[PDB]
Paper text:
Under osmotic stress, bacteria express a heterotetrameric protein complex, [name], which functions as an ATP-dependent K+ pump to maintain intracellular potassium levels. The subunit [name] belongs to the Superfamily of K+ Transporters and adopts a pseudo-tetrameric architecture with a membrane embedded selectivity filter as seen in K+ channels. [name] belongs to the superfamily of P-type ATPases with a conserved binding site for ions within the membrane domain and three cytoplasmic domains that orchestrate ATP hydrolysis via an aspartyl phosphate intermediate. Previous work has hypothesized that K+ moves parallel to the membrane plane through a 40-Å long tunnel that connects the selectivity filter of [name] with a canonical binding site in [name].
In addition, the structure was obtained under the most native conditions to date, namely with uninhibited, wild-type (WT) protein embedded in lipid bilayer nanodiscs under active turnover conditions induced by the addition of K+ and ATP. We also determined a cryo-EM structure at substantially higher resolution (2.1 Å) compared to previous structural studies. Map densities in the catalytic domains of [name] unambigiously show phosphorylation of Asp307 in the P-domain and binding of ADP together with two Mg2+ ions in the nucleotide binding domain (N-domain), confirming the conformation to be E1~P·ADP. Unlike previous structures, our map resolves most of the N-terminus of [name], revealing a potential interaction involving Glu161 from the A-domain, Arg3 from the N-terminus as well as Asp552 and Lys557 from the P-domain. In the current map, however, clear densities are visible at all four sites, likely due to increased resolution, but density at S3 remains much stronger. There are many side chain oxygen atoms in this region that produce a generally hydrophilic environment and our new structure reveals numerous discrete densities within this cavity. Because their magnitude is comparable to or lower than the surrounding protein side chains we model them as water molecules, thus producing a highly hydrated vestibule. Whereas previous structures show 5–7 discrete densities extending from the vestibule into the tunnel, our new structure reveals ~17 spherical densities in this region, all of comparable strength to the surrounding protein density. These densities, which we have modeled as water, are most prevalent near the vestibule, which is the wider part of the tunnel, but then disappear completely at the subunit interface near Phe232, which is the narrowest part of the tunnel and also distinctly hydrophobic. Our higher resolution map shows an exceedingly strong, wellresolved density at the canonical binding site along the axis of the unwound M4 helix, providing compelling evidence that, like other P-type pumps, the transport ion is bound at this canonical site in this state.
Residue numbers in the entry:
A (entry chain B): 2 to 682
B (entry chain A): 1 to 557
C (entry chain D): 1 to 29
D (entry chain C): 3 to 190
The structure:
């Protein structure tokens, strides 16, 4: 993934010519109406040339065999571009199937670590099966970590060897098969049965067996068919038109004229632009469900981003224990430890760890206290332990203050100042309360991903508004929004509020791009038109979202916009190029076609072509060669530039609009000159 | 000569724009379902009497109302021509028309084509001209304007399943716009010398002693609606070249203005309804640029005229053959472009006698689908088809979803737009080909060589595009030509209306999206050039082979 | 009529019908 | 939905076919009776023609108009139309050469360069108008036949010459029928 091979590898070019030959079958050509006409015309000219050779029909057999041969080259060149794009696509798919499956799964009889493990091959693992793994092994199947925490190497899938952190109880519980556990151990509960693995999602992404045409391709095909219909009528009716003014134009010339007129350049390359664009997504470490969602990224005007997990690296670690007035640091840690004994969230574990070195307290366990724990919830924004009589709770400032006011008491003035102080630099303030008495605040440091500021500047230039939606405190969100470069933010946002914001933006008709990492983003990821899920997040977010980013880049929408706009631009530019190519075809064939029926029409031979037969041949040869010459353009796409709509259209109309008017004039003239020099004409 | 031609074009366009702007405001009120001042009281009583409750109808019901009214008018006109001898106002006992001539004439006037394979002064009675032809001149024109009303409403309406009431639109267009404007034009025509009477034919004892029989009839009333509604059906065979129809150059100038009046006002009304006048001006800019160039080429071609005239012994080579002295070569050239860029079809000069290049441009103007100001209503939605192609290509080239006036363009719109665009060129090429493979079609030619093929190509192109003008040398009064052109006129008219109505039905249900920073503007020189390029390139590439064997071969010989 | 004209008319008609069918059902094509 | 369709078509048919033309005829005959009735020229009780319809003049003392390509006879109002002859048609060259030779023989005192309008048929076949320069080309033939001078013929041509409001919407023309009719009164 992300390691490019070549544009013309010798191993795949020879395999593409073999697949192009087997694509000459009428069943394969039936699904492409533009190329089917060329296929039919090639057979008609071949049969006509056979009749002239046998003497059954008067005419020049060599000329008909020369037109028919290049007509077969045109359909072979179109099938070669499609095979090259598909062959390069299946090469990436074959690269991913190559991931090694350990088949060494230590299934556990019971979930708790330390049980006896029985040798079971990986393929027998199904949903709900607990598998124990040790350092240095390979994860057998995708699942959610149920216990333990260790480093995981995901270079097999993401292509980068930087270790990641996987642990239970948080947003790092999701794990994927084929990765290598690094440090201690994990206890993974398989969540997907075989056949629905994340790797299968990546394969079906580039396998392209039965590719589904996007609505843009379908709409373009309608126009291409309509142009073919009008050119077929304008060529078929030419025979009775010329038959009255003299000898009728030969069928071979009419077939050659029709192929040169119908949009063979875009028609033969249309099936290669879609596959190449999907292959460029894999090179960008983006796994898209379908090409339709990719093309929707060219119209998005606002981008919604999560803070923790997406913009920041997550794994919030407590830094200092700031105590309230009248409370010492020793007392603060004791309450903090109690509320985080069973807290498996990354913040909860950091609370317990930080307290040990500060004060070496005896390691209490949950069963020793005979108490229950309140798990952290996005809606509640608080957690703690309801031990006998005494109550310990911690959570967000707003959640704790509301709970304190309902129970009774008032927030100390120093505490409110401390909350603002610790939220100014960017640390999220956690307020811990003991019953109705506030004990202090805890500062959770977070790390903002590097380079996000300049990437966000590129999004601003692209006309995309970046909004940071988070449920954290308003004061700390502003210090993180200004440390990332986003336009606007929305703090203290419940998971039901992010969904409302996407619907509110979609109400006006705009397209919303949403990126998220946590499980609470899954409802808001299925609503946005363009949804990108980090590979380091949960499995629920990965399936709810349209695309998955393997590099966990919050600003990965830039690459999605590139390819999404590139596919549309390549289709439009090539369509304009093909239609504009017909002007020189008329100046080369019409004077040649009626050289004997109307000698006065030779005044339109502005290119001064040598012979009427050489004039028609040069147009047919150029028609075939232009497809092969534009193969790298279709595979790479039209270059994208961050310009305005009126400036991008102007530049594209100058390169492919005016360029399409002038290129065939030079190309046909050069081919005609070469034929004259070689003595063929 | 060039200065005189430039002044004529500038004066015609300046006066047309001045008159069309107030009419656009009035047409915008009809589109917005706002009654014109002073008509609210009359409309309430009239609508109740006629059983029209202004009930909103969808595109299927709106299309059926237009189709039903046209079919009813077709049957009435067809039987009126057949039983003309049994009808009053027949001072000359002209018999009923033949089945093929009546069918062709009935279809021609219903489809707003007004192709005529007869001579009115010796074929039709006053009743047939007044109650049969003039009635369809009003009704066919109102049908086209009603359809473009629905399409304009589709763009300006949000999440709606209805496009107004067709019966209300037809009554409002005919009674408040077509009838009063035609009456003023007709009265001006009478003052200048046009005929308006019901007297029998007048015998004339000439100065030299010969006998002349002057035809009569209510010419002026028919002439006004013939010009205003882009009908083009002349009372006499000479059409607008007849002195009794177009007596002076003053009437001729008004006739050209009346051709472009409603089509230009519709563009002005389109911008006002959408709330952005730049959109309406963009359509006029694209239409005017093509129109201005076309007039200059025809004027230049006709000025050179016949090269043999100087050698034969004349003092000038200007092509005065088939032209009126009171108009001149320059005015005849302008009228030919105006009547062929639009779907009017009236002629003040014989297009068959035009030079090879002089007659090629009017023929090509018809072949591109009649989008250079087009007919009444038909030109606007004909240009809308090319606008949809333009935004589809422009949107792809900028990496954005195609859009026009904030409405997304989907697969269904492209499917209908492609079908609508393909209808007319298919009939022109297939119809002309069928004539060339039959003795009956070929024998109708008058001139030999490539110009003979131009007569056949012009006839089919005019009928399929509902223009009505002709290379009059062709003898089309045959059952083969009457039936073939009737099929082309019928399919060429209603075969575009049905997909356009379906386009309005699909677009009206959508909700317009507000323009963002990345939205491509649809106004300005860049989009005007793109729209012009889309129209010209599609139109040229389709008809280059046919034109090469016709006027191009004639010009180069 | 010549036997080559007849076989040239049906071929155009079949191709036009195939393309018209393809345009109507462009989703499958 | 049949009642709205039938009522709208019938009402519009009556308005456009039985009310609009009746109002136009009543107002036209009241305000402009002469033009609405054909602009007929009458002497005594016999109509001598219409001021807008051209006639076929073949005499030597009469100004000659443009050729008329009518069906039966030249300047036939029962069959209005042009020749519809193409530029490339050799039959048009034959007709022009015959007209040039005929005009040259009938006007031996004029310039050999015949005006173009006198050798080309009009678009209607009833053209009553020629340009003043075209009429002046025939002055020496008319002056000798009618025993008149050049000065009187130029004034008579100018008296029956009309020009448009502006110079580019039309051409200056001479009413041939009216000029020839006045030529008979002057000779009387
Ligand atoms: C004929 C073959 C295709 C031929 C292609 C030729 C390409 C020509 C391009 C020229 C641009 C060079 C600019 C050089 C500098 C010009 C300076 C100036 O004054 O430019 C004024 C405006 C700027 O408008 P704006 O204020 O930026 O934009 C705000 C308004 N929307 O450009 C213009 O008018 C330029 C008009 C260009 C018209 C191009 C038409 C292309 C037709 C394509 C047909 C496709 C068919 C598809 C069918 C399915
Ligand atoms: C309202 C309804 C209107 C309907 C009527 C109008 C329709 C008009 C449309 C199409 C008809 C075109 C005429 C028919 C075309 C030619 C027929 C003919 O006669 O061809 C003779 C040759 C040489 O004969 P020879 O040795 O010189 O003696 O025969 C051959 O090659 C043998 C095979 C003949 C034809 C085979 C293919 C025809 C090609 C047509 C062009 C299509 C372009 C390519 C399509 C893939
Ligand atoms: N384990 C936890 N226990 C108590 N409170 C927490 C815990 N984790 C987060 N919070 C607080 O709950 C609030 C809501 O968090 P959330 O909506 O998940 O924001 P984010 O997505 O930025 O983590 C945050 O302001 C945070 O301070
Ligand atoms: K081509
Ligand atoms: K018409
Ligand atoms: Mg969280
Ligand atoms: Mg968040």
């Amino acid at each position: 993934s992300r390691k490019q091979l070549a544009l013309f590898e010798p191993t795949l070019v020879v395999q593409a010519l073999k697949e192009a030959v087997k694509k000459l079958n009428p069943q394969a050509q039936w699904r492409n109406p533009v190329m089917f006409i060329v296929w039919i015309g090639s057979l008609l000219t071949t049969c006509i040339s056979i009749a002239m050779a046998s003497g059954a029909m008067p005419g020049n057999a060599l000329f008909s065999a020369a037109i028919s041969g290049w007509l077969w080259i045109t359909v072979l060149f179109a099938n070669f571009a499609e095979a090259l794009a598909e062959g390069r696509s299946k090469a990436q798919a074959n690269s991913l199937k190559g991931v090694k499956k350990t088949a060494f799964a230590r299934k556990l009889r019971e979930p708790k670590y330390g049980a006896a493990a029985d040798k079971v091959p990986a393929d027998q693992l199904r949903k709900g099966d607990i598998v124990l793994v040790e350092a240095g092994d390979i994860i057998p199947c995708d699942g959610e970590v149920i216990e333990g925490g260790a480093s995981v190497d995901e270079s097999a899938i993401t292509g980068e060897s930087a270790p990641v952190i996987r642990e239970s109880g948080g947003d790092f519980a999701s794990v994927t098969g084929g990765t290598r556990i690094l440090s201690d151990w994990l206890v993974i509960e398989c969540s997907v049965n075989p056949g629905e693995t994340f790797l299968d999602r990546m394969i079906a992404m580039v396998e392209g067996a039965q590719r589904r045409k996007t609505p843009n391709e379908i709409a373009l095909t309608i126009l291409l068919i309509a142009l073919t219909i009008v050119f077929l009528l304008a060529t078929a009716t030419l025979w009775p038109f010329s038959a009255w003014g003299g000898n009728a134009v030969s069928v071979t010339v009419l077939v050659a004229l029709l192929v040169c007129l119908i949009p063979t350049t875009i028609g033969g390359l249309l099936s290669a632009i879609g596959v190449a664009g999907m292959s460029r997504m894999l090179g960008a470490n983006v796994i898209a469900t379908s090409g339709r969602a990719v093309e929707a990224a060219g119209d998005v005007d606002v981008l919604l981003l999560d803070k923790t997990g997406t913009i920041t690296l997550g794994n919030r670690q407590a830094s200092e224990f700031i105590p309230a007035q009248g409370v010492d640091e020793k007392t603060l840690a004791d309450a903090a430890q109690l509320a985080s004994l069973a807290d498996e969230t990354p913040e909860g574990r950091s609370i317990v760890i930080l307290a040990k070195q500060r004060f070496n307290l005896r390691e209490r366990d949950v069963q020793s206290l005979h108490a229950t724990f309140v798990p952290f919830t996005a809606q509640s924004r608080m957690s703690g332990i309801n031990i006998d009589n005494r109550m310990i709770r911690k959570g967000s400032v707003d959640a704790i203050r509301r709970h304190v006011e309902a129970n009774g008491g008032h927030f100390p003035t120093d505490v409110d100042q401390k909350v603002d102080q610790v939220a100014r630099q960017g640390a999220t303030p956690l307020v811990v309360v003991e019953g109705s008495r506030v004990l202090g605040v805890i500062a959770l440091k977070d790390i903002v991903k590097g380079g996000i500021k300049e990437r966000f500047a590129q999004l601003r230039k692209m006309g995309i508004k970046t909004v940071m939606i988070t449920g954290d405190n308003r004061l700390t969100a502003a210090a993180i929004a200004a440390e990332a470069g986003v336009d606007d933010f929305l703090a203290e946002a419940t998971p039901e509020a992010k969904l409302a914001l996407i619907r509110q933006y979609q109400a006006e008709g705009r397209l919303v791009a949403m990126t998220g990492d946590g499980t609470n983003d899954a409802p808001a990821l299925a609503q946005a038109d363009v949804a990108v899920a980090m590979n380091s997040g949960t499995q629920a977010a990965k399936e709810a979202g349209n695309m998955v980013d393997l590099d966990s880049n919050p600003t990965k929408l830039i690459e999605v916009v590139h390819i999404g706009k590139q596919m549309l631009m390549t289709r439009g530019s090539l369509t304009t190029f093909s239609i504009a190519n017909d002007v020189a075809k008329y100046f080369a064939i019409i004077p040649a076609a009626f050289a004997a029926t109307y000698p006065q029409l030779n005044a339109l031979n502005i290119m001064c072509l040598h012979s009427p037969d050489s004039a028609i041949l040069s147009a047919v040869i150029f028609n075939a060669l232009i497809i092969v010459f534009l193969i790298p353009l279709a595979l790479k796409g039209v270059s994208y530039k961050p310009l305005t709509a009126s400036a991008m259209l102007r530049r594209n109309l100058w390169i492919y609009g005016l360029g399409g008017l002038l290129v065939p004039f030079i190309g046909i003239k050069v081919i005609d000159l070469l034929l004259t020099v070689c003595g063929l004409v | 000569m060039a200065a005189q031609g430039f002044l004529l074009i500038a004066t015609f366009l300046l006066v047309l724009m001045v008159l069309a702007r107030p009419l656009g405001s009035g047409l915008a009120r009809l589109i917005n379902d706002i009654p014109l001042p002073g008509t609210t009281g009359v409309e309430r009583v009239l609508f109740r009497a006629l059983g029209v409750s202004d009930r909103e109808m969808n595109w299927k019901q709106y299309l059926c109302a237009i189709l039903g009214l046209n079919m009813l008018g077709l049957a009435v006109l067809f039987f009126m021509l057949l039983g003309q001898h049994y009808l009053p106002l027949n001072p000359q006992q002209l018999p009923g028309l033949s089945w093929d001539l009546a069918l062709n004439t009935a279809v021609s006037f219903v489809t707003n084509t007004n192709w005529q394979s007869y001579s009115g002064e010796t074929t039709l009675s006053y009743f047939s001209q007044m109650a049969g032809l003039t009635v369809q001149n009003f009704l066919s024109a109102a049908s086209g304007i009603a359809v473009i009303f629905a399409l304009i409403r589709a763009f300006t309406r949000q999440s709606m399943s209805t496009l107004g009431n067709a019966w209300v639109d037809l009554l409002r267009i005919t009674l408040w716009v077509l009838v009063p404007v035609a009456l003023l034009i007709a009265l001006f025509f009478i003052q200048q010398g046009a005929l308006q009477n019901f007297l029998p034919y007048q015998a004339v004892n000439t100065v030299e002693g010969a006998q002349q029989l002057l035809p009569m009839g209510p010419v002026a009333s028919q002439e006004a609606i013939k010009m205003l509604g882009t009908n083009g059906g002349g009372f006499f065979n000479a059409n607008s070249s007849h002195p009794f129809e177009n007596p002076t150059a003053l009437t001729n100038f008004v006739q050209m203005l009346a051709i472009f009046l409603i089509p230009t006002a519709l563009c002005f009304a389109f911008g006002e309804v959408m709330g952005d006048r730049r959109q309406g001006r963009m359509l006029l800019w694209a239409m005017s640029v093509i129109f201005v160039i076309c007039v200059g080429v025809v004027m230049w071609a006709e000025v050179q005229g016949n090269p043999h005239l100087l050698a034969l012994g004349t003092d000038s080579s200007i092509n005065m053959e088939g032209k009126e002295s009171r108009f001149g070569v320059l005015v005849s050239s302008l009228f030919a472009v105006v009547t062929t860029a639009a779907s009017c079809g009236a002629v003040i000069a014989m297009h068959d006698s035009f030079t090879a290049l002089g007659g090629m441009v009017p023929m090509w103007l018809m072949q591109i689908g009649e989008v250079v100001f087009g007919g009444v209503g038909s030109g606007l939605y004909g240009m809308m088809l090319f606008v949809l192609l333009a935004v589809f290509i422009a949107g792809l080239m900028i990496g954005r979803t195609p859009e026009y006036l904030g409405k997304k363009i989907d697969v269904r719109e492209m499917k209908l737009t492609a079908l609508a665009i393909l209808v007319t060129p298919t009939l022109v090429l297939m119809g002309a080909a069928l004539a060339m493979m039959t003795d009956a079609g070929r024998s109708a030619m008058l001139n030999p060589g490539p110009h003979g093929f131009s007569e056949v190509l012009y006839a089919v192109s005019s009928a399929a595009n509902n223009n009505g003008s002709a290379f009059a040398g062709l003898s089309a009064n045959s059952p083969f030509w009457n039936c073939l052109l009737a099929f082309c006129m019928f399919v060429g008219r209603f075969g575009v209306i049905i997909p356009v109505m379906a386009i309005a039905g699909s677009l009206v249900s959508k909700k317009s999206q507000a323009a963002s920073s990345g939205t491509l503007p649809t106004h300005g020189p860049l989009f005007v050039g793109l729209l012009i390029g889309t129209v010209l390139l599609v139109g040229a590439l389709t008809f280059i082979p046919a034109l090469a064997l016709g006027p191009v071969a004639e010009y180069l010989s | 009529m010549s036997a080559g004209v007849i076989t040239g008319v049906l071929l155009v008609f079949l191709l036009l019908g195939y393309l018209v069918y393809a345009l109507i059902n462009a989703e499958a094509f | 939905g049949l009642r709205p369709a039938l009522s709208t078509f019938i009402f519009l048919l009556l308005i456009t076919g039985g009310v609009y033309p009746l109002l136009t005829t009543v107002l036209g005959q009241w305000w402009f009776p002469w033009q609405a009735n054909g602009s007929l020229i009458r002497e005594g009780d016999t109509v001598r023609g219409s001021a807008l319809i051209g006639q076929n003049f073949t005499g030597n003392g009469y100004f000659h108009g443009r050729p008329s390509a009518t069906a039966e006879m030249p300047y036939n109002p029962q069959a209005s139309g042009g020749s519809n002859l193409a530029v490339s048609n050799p039959e048009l060259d034959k007709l022009i050469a015959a007209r040039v030779a005929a005009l040259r023989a009938a006007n031996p005192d004029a310039s050999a360069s015949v005006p173009v309008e006198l050798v080309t048929a009009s678009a209607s076949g009833l053209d009553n108008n020629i340009t003043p320069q075209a009429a002046a080309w025939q002055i020496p033939r008319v002056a000798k036949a009618r025993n008149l001078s050049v000065e009187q013929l130029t004034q008579l041509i100018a008296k029956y010459s009309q020009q448009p409001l502006v110079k580019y919407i039309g051409q200056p023309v001479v009413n041939i029928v009216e000029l020839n009719l006045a030529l008979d009164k002057l000779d009387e």
